[PDB]
Amino acid sequence: GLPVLNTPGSNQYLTADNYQSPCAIPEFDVTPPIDIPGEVRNMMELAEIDTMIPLNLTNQRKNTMDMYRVELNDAAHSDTPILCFSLSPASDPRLAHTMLGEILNYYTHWAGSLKFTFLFCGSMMATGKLLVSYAPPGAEAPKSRKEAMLGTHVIWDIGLQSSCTMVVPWISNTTYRLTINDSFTEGGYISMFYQTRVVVPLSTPRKMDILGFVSACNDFSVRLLRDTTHISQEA
Amino acid sequence: GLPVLNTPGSNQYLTADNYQSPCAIPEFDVTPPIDIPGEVRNMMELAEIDTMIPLNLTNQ
Amino acid sequence: QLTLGNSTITNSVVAYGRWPEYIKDSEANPVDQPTEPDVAACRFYTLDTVTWRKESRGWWWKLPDALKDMGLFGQNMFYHYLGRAGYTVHVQCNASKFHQGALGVFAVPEMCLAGDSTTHMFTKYENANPGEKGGEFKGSFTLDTNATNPARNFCPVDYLFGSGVLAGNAFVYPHQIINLRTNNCATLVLPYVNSLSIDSMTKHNNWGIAILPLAPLDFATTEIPITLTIAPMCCEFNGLRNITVPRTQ
Amino acid sequence: QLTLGNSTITNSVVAYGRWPEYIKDSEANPVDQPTEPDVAACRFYTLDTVTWRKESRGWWWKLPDALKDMGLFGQNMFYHYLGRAGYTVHVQCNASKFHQGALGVFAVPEMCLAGDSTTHMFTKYENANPGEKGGEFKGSFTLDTNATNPARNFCPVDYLFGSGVLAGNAFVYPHQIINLRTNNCATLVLPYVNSLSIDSMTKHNNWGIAILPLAPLDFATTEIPITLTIAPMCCEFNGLRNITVPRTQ
Amino acid sequence: QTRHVIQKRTRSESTVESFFARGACVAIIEVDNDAPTKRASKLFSVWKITYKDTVQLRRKLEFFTYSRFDMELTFVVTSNYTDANNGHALNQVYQIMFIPPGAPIPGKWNDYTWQTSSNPSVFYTYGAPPARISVPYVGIANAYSHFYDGFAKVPLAGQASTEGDSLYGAASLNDFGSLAVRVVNDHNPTKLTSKIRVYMKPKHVRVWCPRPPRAVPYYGPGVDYKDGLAPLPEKGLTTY
Amino acid sequence: SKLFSVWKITYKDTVQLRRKLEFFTYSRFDMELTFVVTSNYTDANNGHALNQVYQIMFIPPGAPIPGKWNDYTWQTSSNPSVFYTYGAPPARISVPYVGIANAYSHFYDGFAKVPLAGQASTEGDSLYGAASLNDFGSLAVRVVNDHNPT
Ligand SMILES: CCCCCCCCCCCCC/C=C/[C@H](O)[C@H](N)CO
Ligand SMILES: CCCCCCCCCCCCC/C=C/[C@H](O)[C@H](N)CO
């Protein structure tokens, strides 16, 4: 026969290998495909879809629909945050279980910009301005609007547009961040504050809800496929 | 199959061998290199750099 | 102004960017001449109106199940072994400028719902196909402990989207938000979505419609109606025989 | 005569033959518009002068740590998540024709220094980042035996170059010799050296400066000052937010 | 404001092909080589082919409603002695016969069905590299259905309760047959136990109609849930 | 008996390769891993064993670490795994350059965290020279076979 020399790796089974193998059903007349709607070519397509953030994971709200609603009211202006969460899309509990977080938890590395949309669900008669801020990491997380306004931010007029989108641009020392809580690849902070205040006339609800959505931008990518911690099997 | 005959050396692991092997992370989007200063191509480059001689190896 | 047959309706989402269409000759599995009732069946039918309250958890319908008793569409559905249709779903919910609340309207292909028993896949046909009345989501899961006469019904929990997935991710499905401060209607155009060119309408529900309160209804003092108007589109039917009469209750 | 901004200085080594440069568009990781303070921060700052004695073992500084309190450069460093800079280091040490002694001035990328404890990598941030005062090499290694209140400081031994390598080989790093009989100054031009295009200046020190007495100072009778003047070069900053305020002491 | 960045990152490893380009364990089939009269040793085992006996591949697949792919099956065979006082054994040979729907299921480890004149069979020698075969897309539909919102039967008026009843979401769209596994060797004086781990790799994958991933523990072949209905942890609204 | 073992991937458990690498500050390379597997009996009075099969699963950072030799994680649906048969030539795989930076850092003169004023001593403390630039995951190794009497 042809002289051959078996190298290391011979006879192993690497689950990630890509080798040919014999067909157990030769000459099978495969049913041809049809043009089903909604074909998906890349998992990032799913990550680019806005999905609702469970922003309110309090004891009484977590694992209910209330966890998706953040309550604003028409009280007097303050500089204290409405909501706060870290830019760890795979490991921050508010973001981990979003579609983006679910996809990222199958990968070790992620990079790219993010889109955070906020939808105001108060009455048409309610007016107000909010400030939505991204602070890159390395400093104290914004405790008040005075600090938050120094970072990237957007002023949202709820009276004008019920929805506001803030793009958190990719800014990182590393070319990729890990999909775990990691100090070296920490992604920064996201906060919301009252810019002026929510104002309502009489005979109007004085408390309303906003909803948060997160998605990946077109520059987003992931690497190093891995098993997720979000599913387990017992026994 | 194609007639083959395994020669001596088959199934050994020579630490100095240069063989192909399957990739455990296929389709990985490698981070591209940057032009870091001070790249070294050959160890002799390091040997051509003057370094101080410990000429006086007395007890003290 | 959207007109189909004799029906007219006076923000819009085409699911997967695919308008409903007829079977191409290159995708047609059955060989008999299809029935295409066109306007007589491809028209808007208005379902029974439901009531949105502060305590409402959500509503769900199945298509074509919700239209099974809608005139000639229902007749053609029950007279044929095979049926295919897209849909235009028009959710109507108006309120005052002093009301607040938001609905997520999701069109879900193969909207399978969780049961109410330790026995797997035990929801019986009658409960899985409620018709135009549809069903409602629940706040929590209640296991049915009646062994003699099990309810054998769905127990779809709202935050689990009735199928063990977080409701916040249901936006991956084709959807529209009715935000009372912005709009009073949602229009979803659903192509026929299935792993086959055509299937049994009575056996199989191609689409589910889930309406969840994303923001609870509120009013300074309250209940407001929600009305579904659904037109089947590009209807095709095959396999004519005696009428199917499904068991009920 | 070397001029940067409003500062002027009146033998020279470009580390790795690479002049400092700005990030190319093809190497830029962050997407936000960088801040380039140019002259306001890219200027010579003079550190506190140290004293070379017969008994001196050596001195070390970290960059950008040594400049963290240098006017607008320090302000930009602490106001931004990401920072990048090369340096021009000018070591100044003059003496008489009747003095003798030699200094090795080494610029070391990633100049990690050995600790003082059996606990690995235990040097705390405050001691690892002394600022303009820098630190000094020791003649020998003294293990810190205080368990209640460990010093958690570097113990850099001179002949081990503070990191367990023979000092005689430190000339593989970019370097200059100040031989009192020949010259009174050393100029090292350091490009930004890192495994990333840009990094956190507060977390990471890109360069270390080590000044070792290769030949002890002597005079026929003595102490002479050594003054470091460092200009950051091609500064870029990204990720503006509230100012970082590192914990001290 | 943003600068100009010549982006180089690609999405090569997030293509649906790459996302499923892994062998995933879908079953652990236990068989015994032992005397036929022990009555505790299973001389052959029949496993219905499915991806729902495990969860990881199931969750990944159920990210989507419809799929179409060829399949690669890799069989990893391990064996061990069960006692030390009955001598030793010679190297075992295993038969893994694919029984498509309708073909006779073996009733005994050595009945006629193992002739496998028309069933594909793989004979694996113990110690050889794990066996491997490939199958094309064999769905009777134009795609596999991960979710089927319907019934195999429609109950008809006038039929008793027992008639017309079928499981919700159960259709023959996923009836792919079974694998029958035996040890071909006649028994040694000592009992030997073997496990065949089946690893499935979709290839040339196409998927349609993405879905939110499973968020609570799987409960049965359907979408039912009973336990672990509180996946979200507690976190303050204004806590970073 | 440790039915499975988890080893964090690093070149610093031994010295020779470490010294050679640390001749340099930054490196960029693909890696070839070769696994040489040896086994032996521990006693002579409990019979014999059949040829063992070993699972070597790469667990990238964030993936669930196995807690038991036969827990769900060994399904390895997304983790690369190599199944090695005892007596076969040593297993071998290759990996590209997987650094999140543009090069591996053999020396990192910094911290993962900067302590901030007003934070207690316990907060903001990280090991000197420790960064996630070298967080490459782990290898989890088990014997797939069920146990023999010995
Ligand atoms: C030598 C005989 C053994 C090898 C032949 C194995 C037969 C495999 C044929 C059945 C094909 C199953 C394909 C996968 C089934 C999954 O449930 C669907 N793909 C789900 O999408
Ligand atoms: C089948 C699974 C096992 C095979 C996969 C092994 C995974 C290896 C991925 C990690 C890559 C490590 C590369 C080397 C790390 C060193 O610390 C750096 N190169 C130092 O310069």
Coordinates of C-alpha atoms in Angstrom, one line a residue, chain D residues 18-226:
Chain D
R18 CA 9.8 54.0 16.6
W19 CA 8.8 57.6 17.1
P20 CA 5.5 58.2 19.1
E21 CA 2.5 58.4 16.8
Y22 CA -1.3 58.8 16.9
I23 CA -3.6 55.8 16.5
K24 CA -4.1 55.0 12.8
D25 CA -7.7 54.7 11.7
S26 CA -7.0 51.1 10.9
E27 CA -5.9 50.4 14.5
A28 CA -8.5 52.4 16.4
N29 CA -10.6 50.2 18.7
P30 CA -12.8 52.9 20.4
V31 CA -15.3 54.6 18.1
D32 CA -15.9 57.9 20.0
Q33 CA -14.1 61.0 18.9
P34 CA -10.7 61.0 20.8
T35 CA -9.6 64.0 22.8
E36 CA -6.2 65.4 21.7
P37 CA -5.2 68.1 24.2
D38 CA -1.9 68.6 22.2
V39 CA 0.3 71.3 23.7
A40 CA -1.8 71.9 26.9
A41 CA -0.9 68.3 28.0
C42 CA 1.9 67.3 25.6
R43 CA 4.6 69.3 27.3
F44 CA 7.6 68.7 29.6
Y45 CA 6.8 68.3 33.3
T46 CA 9.7 68.3 35.8
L47 CA 9.4 65.7 38.5
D48 CA 10.7 66.2 42.1
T49 CA 14.5 65.9 42.0
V50 CA 16.1 62.9 43.7
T51 CA 19.6 62.7 45.3
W52 CA 22.3 60.4 44.0
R53 CA 24.6 59.4 46.9
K54 CA 27.5 56.9 47.2
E55 CA 25.0 54.5 48.8
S56 CA 22.1 55.0 46.3
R57 CA 20.9 51.7 44.9
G58 CA 18.6 53.1 42.2
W59 CA 15.2 54.7 41.4
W60 CA 12.1 53.8 39.5
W61 CA 9.0 55.5 38.2
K62 CA 6.0 54.3 36.2
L63 CA 4.4 56.1 33.3
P64 CA 1.8 57.5 33.0
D65 CA 1.7 57.1 36.9
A66 CA 4.5 59.6 37.5
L67 CA 2.6 62.3 35.5
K68 CA -0.9 61.7 37.0
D69 CA -0.7 65.0 38.9
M70 CA 0.9 67.0 36.1
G71 CA -1.7 69.7 35.3
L72 CA -3.9 69.2 32.3
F73 CA -2.3 65.8 31.3
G74 CA -3.3 64.5 34.7
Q75 CA -6.8 66.0 34.4
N76 CA -7.3 64.4 31.0
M77 CA -6.0 61.1 32.3
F78 CA -8.4 61.0 35.2
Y79 CA -11.4 62.3 33.2
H80 CA -11.1 59.6 30.5
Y81 CA -11.6 55.9 30.6
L82 CA -8.9 55.4 27.9
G83 CA -5.6 57.1 27.3
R84 CA -2.6 56.7 25.1
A85 CA 0.7 58.6 25.1
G86 CA 4.4 58.2 24.2
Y87 CA 7.0 60.0 26.2
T88 CA 10.2 62.0 26.0
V89 CA 12.2 61.3 29.2
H90 CA 15.1 63.7 29.9
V91 CA 17.3 62.6 32.8
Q92 CA 19.5 65.5 34.0
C93 CA 22.5 64.9 36.2
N94 CA 25.5 67.2 36.0
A95 CA 28.7 67.1 38.1
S96 CA 32.3 68.3 37.9
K97 CA 35.1 67.0 35.8
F98 CA 36.5 65.7 39.1
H99 CA 33.4 63.6 39.9
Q100 CA 32.9 60.1 38.6
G101 CA 30.0 57.7 38.3
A102 CA 27.7 56.3 35.8
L103 CA 23.9 55.8 35.6
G104 CA 22.0 53.3 33.5
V105 CA 18.6 54.8 32.5
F106 CA 16.3 52.1 31.2
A107 CA 12.8 52.4 29.7
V108 CA 11.1 49.1 30.3
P109 CA 7.7 48.2 28.7
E110 CA 5.5 46.5 31.3
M111 CA 8.0 47.0 34.1
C112 CA 6.5 44.6 36.6
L113 CA 8.2 44.6 40.0
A114 CA 8.5 41.9 42.6
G115 CA 6.6 42.1 45.8
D116 CA 7.7 41.9 49.4
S117 CA 5.6 39.0 50.7
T118 CA 5.0 35.3 50.3
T119 CA 1.6 36.1 48.9
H120 CA 1.9 36.3 45.1
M121 CA 1.1 39.6 43.3
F122 CA 0.1 41.2 46.6
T123 CA 1.4 44.8 46.0
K124 CA -1.5 47.1 46.5
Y125 CA -2.5 49.8 44.0
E126 CA -1.3 52.7 46.2
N127 CA 2.2 51.4 46.5
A128 CA 2.4 50.2 42.9
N129 CA 1.5 53.8 41.8
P130 CA 3.6 56.1 43.9
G131 CA 3.3 59.0 41.5
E132 CA 6.1 61.5 40.7
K133 CA 8.1 60.5 43.8
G134 CA 8.6 57.0 42.3
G135 CA 10.4 54.4 44.3
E136 CA 13.9 53.1 45.0
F137 CA 15.7 49.8 44.4
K138 CA 17.1 47.9 47.3
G139 CA 20.4 46.1 47.8
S140 CA 18.8 42.9 49.0
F141 CA 15.4 41.2 49.4
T142 CA 13.6 41.7 52.7
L143 CA 10.5 39.5 53.1
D144 CA 7.7 41.4 54.9
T145 CA 6.8 39.3 57.9
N146 CA 4.0 41.6 59.3
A147 CA 0.8 39.5 59.0
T148 CA -1.6 41.9 60.7
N149 CA -0.7 45.0 58.5
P150 CA 1.4 43.8 55.6
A151 CA 3.3 46.5 53.8
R152 CA 2.1 45.1 50.4
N153 CA 4.8 47.0 48.7
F154 CA 7.4 46.3 46.0
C155 CA 10.8 45.0 47.1
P156 CA 12.8 45.6 43.9
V157 CA 16.4 44.3 44.2
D158 CA 18.9 46.2 42.1
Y159 CA 21.0 43.4 40.7
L160 CA 17.8 41.5 40.0
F161 CA 16.4 44.6 38.2
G162 CA 13.5 44.5 40.6
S163 CA 11.9 41.6 38.7
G164 CA 14.2 38.5 39.1
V165 CA 16.5 39.2 36.1
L166 CA 20.1 40.1 36.1
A167 CA 20.6 43.9 36.0
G168 CA 23.4 43.5 33.5
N169 CA 20.9 42.3 30.9
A170 CA 18.6 45.2 31.3
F171 CA 20.4 46.9 28.4
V172 CA 18.2 44.8 26.1
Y173 CA 15.6 47.4 27.0
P174 CA 15.9 50.8 25.4
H175 CA 18.5 52.6 27.5
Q176 CA 21.1 55.4 27.8
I177 CA 24.2 55.6 30.0
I178 CA 25.0 58.9 31.7
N179 CA 28.7 58.7 32.3
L180 CA 29.7 61.7 34.4
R181 CA 33.0 62.1 32.5
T182 CA 31.2 62.2 29.1
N183 CA 27.6 63.5 29.5
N184 CA 25.2 65.0 32.0
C185 CA 21.9 64.1 30.4
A186 CA 20.0 61.2 28.8
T187 CA 17.1 61.5 26.4
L188 CA 14.8 58.5 25.7
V189 CA 11.9 58.8 23.2
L190 CA 9.4 56.1 24.0
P191 CA 6.5 55.3 21.6
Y192 CA 3.3 54.0 23.1
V193 CA 4.0 50.3 23.7
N194 CA 1.1 48.0 24.6
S195 CA -0.8 45.0 23.3
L196 CA -3.7 47.3 22.6
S197 CA -4.0 50.5 20.6
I198 CA -5.3 52.3 23.7
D199 CA -5.8 51.3 27.3
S200 CA -6.8 52.6 30.7
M201 CA -4.0 54.9 32.0
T202 CA -5.2 54.5 35.6
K203 CA -5.3 50.7 35.6
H204 CA -2.1 50.2 33.5
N205 CA 1.4 51.7 33.4
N206 CA 2.8 51.3 29.9
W207 CA 6.4 52.2 30.8
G208 CA 8.8 52.0 33.7
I209 CA 11.8 54.1 34.1
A210 CA 14.7 52.5 36.1
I211 CA 17.8 54.5 36.9
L212 CA 20.6 52.3 38.4
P213 CA 24.1 53.4 39.5
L214 CA 26.2 51.3 37.2
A215 CA 29.3 53.0 38.7
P216 CA 28.9 54.4 42.2
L217 CA 29.2 58.2 42.5
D218 CA 32.6 59.3 43.9
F219 CA 34.4 62.5 44.5
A220 CA 37.8 63.2 46.0
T221 CA 36.4 64.7 49.2
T222 CA 29.2 63.8 48.1
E223 CA 25.7 64.0 46.6
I224 CA 24.4 65.2 43.2
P225 CA 20.8 65.7 42.1
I226 CA 19.0 63.8 39.4

